Design a binder for these strands. Structure first.
Ligand SMILES: [Zn+2]
Ligand SMILES: [Zn+2]
Lengths: 179, 141, 342, 134, 29, 83, 211, 39, 301
RNA sequence: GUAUGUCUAAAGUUAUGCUCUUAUUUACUAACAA
RNA sequence: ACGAAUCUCUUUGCCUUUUGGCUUAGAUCAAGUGUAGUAUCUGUUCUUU
């Protein structure tokens, strides 16, 4: 009752320009571009820093660009460890399968209904089971007609135009010589 | 990854000091549940207390069970997770378990999912917790 | 409700654009010209990536072979000059995303990481960060300076035929074979919104210059999408045309689409009106399937289309300056209504 | 465990060909209006492979039951592949002439390719001779 | 096509011989 | 025949198979308990099993109908011969 | 005895060759040759090309066809392969026609048995070995069961040994759910159904135990 | 037996995989600084 | 063979390991997935089956048969809410495929939750689906004994499919309906709509011609032929390019003058004749029928 | 002869037309001899 | 006779165990014995059916 497939709705199909052309989709604001850049740039710089200080090559350490656990308060610290022992004891290149986490459903939503051309076409589009003159993987024997083909040696006509003249010429030349 | 989630430690466990000084080793151990690197936090409860308390499980695991990261107890009631699941199963329902997969690959996978387990859904929202408590009380009498 | 919308459509008028003619032809490469990309700072030279792997740089004015560049092994599937900084990125089936420097004509930095033959590169307009995606079904994001992958926008469930980097929040438009397109909260590592209005491989996408939108292609339909909300904007009249290879939009709302039929399509980007079909020619010796425009891009001017066809030809197209509303009008636009999308 | 191997001289060909068949397969799926299964793509790609071999032989690849568009597409893709091959061969032979570092195996391969190429050329000349007199 | 206004070009060699850069290094004097 | 038509036509059929012979919502939980007839669901279960069984036996008969070497090839030549 | 190949095409042999051709196709002439203990690869291929291939023809030539032939002879002097092609016939036959116009079983059965055996055996050694291992494995399993069952009958309960896990993250699927991707969260309520199915499961287990 | 490529090794799994923390040869910092245009 | 419990457990394990292994190589072989799920079903462990289905779904959503199989599996164990929830989810994912919707519909019908089937049908129709959906809905709403609200959906069924076939179908329905007043009313409505959107923004001349014909024959069954005549005049007036229209009119005249019929019809035949090339026969016909200026002009031509 | 791959390596998890006899072939295999 | 249901067959529709890469066809087509095994041969006799 007004909830059956509440995720899908027709207004997603509706083109929002087909009604009203020159619906000026605003090219983003320069100020807001500065915002986005600032955010994302900050993020990626942090990420790269993390990547760098992570890695064992101390060489790449020089390109690196408090808390409370309730109402109760506490000081967090990072104890420096012996630079012999592994920096990150935890990480050991685990294989891990990802759960998808597609908790929200999303439609796949195409608008068409082709009957005449859509049914006449498959009779044309139906591809024959490809069989080779080279290589059976499964070793299926098959009919000899289906094996060997081409069947187009027939031509014979345009090829001859000139040969007649040539062989005839030879014959006549020979005749002339002979007599 | 970035240190996005904060550590999930309870009060009793942590001890009654206005300010303790704990340390964080990032990517600092595989957890006790899902064999998976996480930021290991640890601290002596007092300065001169000999026993360090280290954060056994990972934060995702903690959230998932809705527990302390050092006690392995529910963050609300400070009781064994299994026991709390039994209690929950008893009141309001017939069946509430929190099945950990005992296979090393699958456990990781399970840990990765951002989905609360049986009892954790009750104990997360405090309203629901309260409701459960009152129902339990009713059941008693 | 359909009748209302249809009526509204008929009420409006898609504007007249000057039609096109085949201005220049260049039989330059010895393979398909699967990539074409044009320098956006100066509008002087445009490079084209062959299947030979020798991406060749072409002056527009003369048309001559400015210079060859051959750092790759396999087909240079895509390239992308950064107007922001003088770096020609490219990418092959060899999984490399090599960054050339044009201040030296050599390669500078390779971006290792990609599991499978990467199809497309797109540089970020407002950052020193580039996006690339291939058969891996993953759109990676490289920090240029440090040549690491910063982030990996997993999501797509199939190879990812195009990508477009934008300046806004949805910083990436990822167009896949998976019959989808994605907009991403790049910082989050999450698709903010996922448009799916395609039956088939979404294998030709283009950002509009001055609109902040992105057209995408399927086997036939060519949607055009408004990527602020993550909303549809306009279905097109591509009902019988072929599989669209490339889809470069002009400055002046003149959306191009390249057919596997071979037929150059031409649309008014605002409306959808197919204001010119143009069946291309092949080179004398070619076969009739080979006439297939596999690449396309417009200049800064927007008055020269360049098309990387599989006839090993780099065909170029001018708009007719002799044209009027009576001398070559469009193809008499008509919304079909036959259970249609419009 | 994210090993991913680069292309090298040793695995270049295999990678090439897999990329090719992926492309071809994609194109055919785009074309095909029924939205057929992967198992029906096996027929397609296998068909392609046979076509390639036929081209190599210089026996015309004229399978009757196909749709024309598919036949076109495959013809195109083998022409691309063929182009790649022939040019590669030519490059190799100049390389061999130069006396460069080249794989014994690679030189044999090039010999084979160039032979097939030669035969193809030759019998094409025979055809030409036939088709428009001596 | 020898007749038409389509201008074909069967190019081969580079003009700039892989020395002359494609973009030039802007600087002080 | 498309999967559009073949769906509706099969829909029409099983409606003839039908032609042979309450909502309560807790909006806080979101749980829409549609208490309906347990006898009818059982009648669906048995009918649907019977439909699938009928189809299952239909193949079994058609498999037992009969230029090849092995089980698969015989069928593969049959896939060629139908064209 | 080993020897140099040749001889004459016995009809059985021809048939075998045809079968081979159907199997392996017209460009693996070595294999087909191998199938025939007497005849060579080259011989075989030639035979197929010349006599045996069904897309040839040996029907007589019409008067028009005769004219075409003899005219070709007149014009192309004894280039009979070319002439054959022109005709659309095999060459030897054409030549013969032109000329006309101008004027033991144990062994055979051995190769047959071997042949049929081969053609009906279409798998590389990897396959054969694999199926062998499969059946052997099955046998082993049943033997193990027989022991276990025997002991149960005897009164000693022995749990079946796990597969000696190949790697650290190797999975047993009976331990716990494979990769429990749960159903989509419930819009319609599911509680009674959960109960009923649980009961059914437990009941099934009970039945199995009793079974 | 030995089979063509169809569904590529998708970098979804490689993303969810744990880091290695090895130092490859080419990821050593080459051309630290970027160039820029006049604008 | 499969006697004791633990042994069965081992069997289950081994089988799983096989199935799992085969899935690992070809993540996509839905035949393999669905087979595995069938195995789970057979084992009478439903949860695992569900999980398998879910995984399978994730791997490839677009494969409809998988969805159907899962659905039916759910149905099998009388876990109807799960089936329903799933089917809703399927709809949400792939609404533009029909078989899912139909599967849902049949399920609900068998359930005899008729209100819900109406409601869902309303939804599906609202998404501008295929004509097929509309028709099936109508059949349902006719199989439902009532004849109100059906009217509204017919009105909407034009709204989604402005096709003359729709209108004609509606008219046919009203023919089944007892009250003839609405039949005429419907005709009036249709004609009015045609008038309003007169210009080239709908169906061809054919469909309109067909409509006019149908209307004319309805009226023919009814009393008022005056109005039919008026409509015809209006039709010729309102519409140009009246080959179909004129033909229909001619036919009606013949039914219900003779000279006129022979005249216009014959002329049409000449047009038809012209289209073929009996051109002599055409010209002659014209000459005889005529007007005589057009006879001699067209004769000259 | 090998790669390689399995196997073993000990402690008890608390439930009530045929059978036959032979001689011969051929094939394959054989780090067994010649 | 119309309506329906059940069963069998036939025609079509569905392909329902229905070919899953690349390279120089990826390359090259032999001179064996006795000893054993294994299978396959064939005869060979008799028995009883
Ligand atoms: Zn605690
Ligand atoms: Zn954990």
């Amino acid at each position: 009752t007004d909830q059956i497939a509440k995720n899908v709705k027709l207004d997603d199909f509706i083109p929002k320009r087909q009604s009203n052309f020159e619906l000026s989709v605003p090219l983003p604001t320069k100020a807001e571009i500065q915002e986005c850049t600032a955010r994302t740039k900050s993020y990626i710089q942090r990420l790269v820093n993390a990547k760098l200080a992570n890695s064992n090559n101390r060489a790449s350490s020089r390109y690196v660009t408090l808390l409370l656990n309730n109402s109760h308060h506490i000081e967090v610290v990072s104890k420096q460890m012996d630079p012999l022992l592994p920096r990150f004891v935890g990480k050991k290149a685990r294989k891990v399968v990802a759960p998808t986490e597609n908790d929200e459903v999303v439609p796949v939503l195409h608008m068409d209904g082709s009957n005449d051309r859509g049914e006449a076409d498959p009779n044309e589009w139906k591809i024959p089971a490809a069989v080779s003159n080279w290589k059976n993987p499964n070793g299926y024997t098959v009919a000899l007609e289906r094996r060997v083909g081409k069947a187009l040696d027939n031509e014979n006509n345009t090829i001859n135009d000139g040969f007649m003249k040539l062989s005839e010429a030879l014959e006549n030349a020979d005749k002339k010589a002979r007599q | 990854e970035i240190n996005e989630p904060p550590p999930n430690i309870c009060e009793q466990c942590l001890g009654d000091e206005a300010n303790i000084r704990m340390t964080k080793i990032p990517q600092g151990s595989e957890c006790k549940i899902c064999t998976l690197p996480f930021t290991l936090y640890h601290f002596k409860t007092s300065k001169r207390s000999n026993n360090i308390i280290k954060t056994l499980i990972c934060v995702r695991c903690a959230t998932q069970r809705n527990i302390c990261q050092c006690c392995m107890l529910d963050s609300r009631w400070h009781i064994p997770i299994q026991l709390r699941d039994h209690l929950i199963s008893l009141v309001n329902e017939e069946n509430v378990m929190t099945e950990e997969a005992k296979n090393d690959m699958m456990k990781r996978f399970l840990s990765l999912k951002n989905v609360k387990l049986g009892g954790a859904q009750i104990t997360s929202d405090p309203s629901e917790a309260d409701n459960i408590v009152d129902k339990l009380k009713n059941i008693l009498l | 409700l359909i009748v209302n919308r249809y009526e509204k459509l008929l009420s409006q008028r898609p504007e007249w654009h000057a039609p096109w003619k085949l201005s220049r032809v260049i039989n330059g490469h010895l393979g398909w010209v699967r990539c074409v990309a044009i320098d956006p700072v100066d509008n002087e030279w445009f490079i084209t990536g062959s299947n030979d792997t020798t991406m060749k740089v072409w002056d527009l004015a003369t048309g001559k072979l400015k210079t060859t560049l051959a750092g790759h092994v396999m087909t240079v599937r895509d390239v992308a000059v950064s107007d922001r900084h003088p770096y020609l990125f490219s990418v092959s089936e060899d999984k490399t995303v090599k960054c050339w420097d044009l201040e030296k004509n050599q390669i500078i930095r390779d971006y290792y990481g990609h599991l499978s033959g990467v199809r497309t590169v797109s540089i970020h307009p407002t950052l020193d960060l580039i996006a690339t995606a291939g058969r891996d079904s993953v759109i990676k994001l490289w920090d240029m300076r440090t040549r690491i992958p910063v982030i990996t926008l997993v999501g797509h469930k199939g190879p990812i035929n195009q990508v477009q980097c934008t300046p806004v929040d949805p910083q990436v438009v990822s167009s896949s074979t998976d019959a989808t397109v994605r907009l991403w909260d790049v910082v989050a590592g999450k698709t903010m919104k996922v448009l799916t209005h395609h039956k088939r491989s979404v294998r030709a996408t283009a950002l509009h210059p001055k609109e902040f939108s992105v057209a995408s292609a399927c086997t036939d339909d060519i949607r055009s999408w408004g990527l602020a909300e993550g909303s549809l904007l306009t279905n097109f009249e591509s009902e019988k045309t072929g599989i669209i290879n490339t889809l470069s939009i002009n400055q002046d709302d003149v959306l191009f689409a390249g057919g596997d039929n071979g037929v150059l399509s031409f649309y008014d980007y605002k409306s959808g009106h197919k204001y010119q079909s143009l069946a291309t020619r092949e080179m004398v010796g070619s076969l009739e399937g080979e006439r297939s425009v596999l690449c396309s891009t417009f200049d800064k001017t927007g008055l020269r289309l360049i098309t990387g066809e599989a006839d090993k030809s780099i065909k170029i197209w001018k708009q007719d300056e002799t044209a009027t509303k009576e001398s070559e009008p469009g193809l008499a636009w008509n919304p079909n209504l036959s259970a249609k999308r419009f | 465990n994210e090993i991913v191997k680069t292309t090298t001289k040793q695995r270049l060909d295999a990678y090439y060909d897999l990329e090719l068949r992926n492309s071809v397969m994609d194109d055919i799926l785009e074309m095909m209006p029924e939205s057929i299964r992967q198992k029906k793509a096996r027929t397609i790609l296998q068909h392609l492979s046979e076509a390639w071999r036929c081209w190599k032989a210089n026996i015309p690849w004229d399978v009757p039951g196909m749709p024309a568009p598919i036949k076109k597409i495959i013809e195109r893709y083998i022409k691309s592949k063929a182009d790649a091959w022939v040019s590669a061969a030519h490059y190799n032979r100049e390389r061999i002439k130069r006396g460069a570092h080249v794989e014994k195996t690679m030189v044999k391969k090039n010999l084979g390719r160039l032979t097939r190429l030669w035969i193809k050329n030759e019998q094409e000349r025979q055809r030409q001779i036939q088709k428009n007199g001596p | 096509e020898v007749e038409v206004l389509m201008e074909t070009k069967n190019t081969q060699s580079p003009q700039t011989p892989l020395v002359e850069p494609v973009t030039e290094r802007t600087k002080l004097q | 025949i498309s999967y559009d038509q073949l769906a509706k036509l099969s829909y029409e059929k099983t409606l003839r198979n039908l032609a042979t012979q309450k909502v309560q919502k807790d909006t806080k939980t979101g749980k829409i308990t549609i208490a309906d007839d347990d006898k009818l669901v059982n009648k669906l279960a048995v009918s649907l099993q019977s439909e699938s069984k009928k189809r299952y036996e239909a193949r079994k008969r058609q498999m037992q109908n009969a230029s090849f070497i092995n089980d698969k090839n015989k069928q593969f030549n049959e896939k060629l011969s139908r064209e | 005895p080993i020897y140099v190949k040749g001889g004459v095409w016995t009809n059985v042999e021809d048939q075998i060759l045809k079968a081979a051709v159907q199997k392996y196709g017209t460009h693996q002439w070595s294999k087909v040759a191998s199938l025939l203990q007497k005849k060579t690869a080259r011989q075989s291929e030639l035979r197929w090309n010349e006599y045996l291939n069904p897309k040839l023809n040996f029907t007589e030539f019409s008067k028009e066809e005769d004219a075409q032939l003899l005219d070709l002879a007149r014009e192309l002097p004894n280039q009979w392969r070319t002439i054959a092609d022109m005709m659309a016939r095999p060459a030897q036959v054409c030549v013969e026609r032109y000329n006309r116009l101008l004027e033991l079983e144990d062994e055979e059965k051995e190769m047959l048995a071997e042949a049929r055996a081969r053609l009906l055996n279409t798998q590389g050694k990897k396959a054969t070995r694999k199926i062998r291992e499969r059946m052997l494995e099955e046998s082993k399993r049943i033997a193990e069961l027989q022991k276990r069952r025997e002991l149960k009958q005897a009164g000693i309960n022995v749990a079946i040994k796990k597969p000696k896990k190949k790697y650290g993250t190797d999975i047993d699927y009976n331990e716990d759910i494979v990769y429990e991707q749960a159903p989509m969260p419930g819009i319609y309520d599911t509680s009674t159904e959960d109960r009923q199915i649980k009961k059914k499961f437990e009941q099934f287990e009970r039945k199995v135990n009793r079974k | 037996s030995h089979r063509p490529q169809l569904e590529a090794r998708s970098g979804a799994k490689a993303a969810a995989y744990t880091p290695t923390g090895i130092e490859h040869a080419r990821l050593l910092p080459g051309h630290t600084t970027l160039k820029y245009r006049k604008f | 063979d499969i006697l004791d419990l633990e042994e069965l457990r081992e069997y289950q394990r081994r089988k799983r390991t096989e199935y799992e292994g085969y899935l690992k190589r070809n993540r996509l072989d839905m035949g393999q997935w669905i087979r595995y799920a069938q195995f789970e079903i057979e084992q009478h462990d439903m949860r695992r089956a569900r999980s398998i289905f879910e995984r399978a779904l994730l791997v490839d959503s677009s494969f409809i048969p998988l969805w159907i199989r899962y659905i039916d599996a759910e149905l099998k164990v009388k876990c109807i809410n799960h089936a329903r929830n799933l089917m809703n989810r399927a709809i949400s994912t792939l609404p533009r495929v029909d078989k899912l919707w139909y599967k849902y519909l049949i399920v609900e019908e068998s359930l005899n939750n008729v209100e819900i089937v109406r409601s869902l049908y309303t939804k599906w129709c609202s998404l501008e689906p295929g004509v097929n959906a509309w028709n099936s809905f109508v059949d349902f709403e006719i199989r439902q004994k009532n004849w109100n609200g059906v009217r509204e959906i017919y009105s909407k069924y034009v709204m989604a499919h402005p096709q003359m076939q729709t209108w004609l179908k509606w008219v046919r329905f009203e023919n089944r309906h007892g009250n003839t007043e609405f039949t005429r009313s419907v005709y009036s409505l249709a004609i009015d709509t045609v008038a309003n959107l007169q210009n080239l923004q709908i169906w061809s001349d054919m469909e309109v011609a067909k409509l006019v014909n149908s209307f004319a024959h309805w009226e023919a069954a009814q009393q008022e032929y005056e109005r039919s005549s008026a409509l015809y005049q209006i039709a010729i007036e309102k519409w140009p390019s009246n080959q179909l229209l004129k033909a229909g009119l001619l036919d009606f005249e013949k039914q219900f003058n003779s000279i006129e019929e022979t005249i216009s019809y014959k002329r049409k035949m000449e047009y038809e004749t012209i289209l073929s090339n009996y051109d002599t026969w055409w010209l002659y016909l014209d000459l005889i029928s005529e007007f005589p200026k057009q006879i001699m002009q067209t004769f000259e031509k």
